[PDB]
User: Fold this.
Amino acid sequence: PRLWEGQDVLARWTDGLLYLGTIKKVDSAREVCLVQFEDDSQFLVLWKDISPAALP
Amino acid sequence: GGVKKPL
Ligand SMILES: [Zn+2]
Ligand SMILES: [Zn+2]
Assistant:
């Protein structure tokens, strides 16, 4: 899958800035992921705000 | 999905 649990990603916050995050659980039906950030916080992030932290 | 753009 293009996204998976434990994948390192870049996620856009509402400020418009990208943060390094880690995916914890993916919900393909809602195009949403659980992402945890360097402060251990967790958010739900729409797929359109997620990109892999790795080039193909 | 993403942004819908016209041609
Ligand atoms: Zn910690
Ligand atoms: Zn979509």
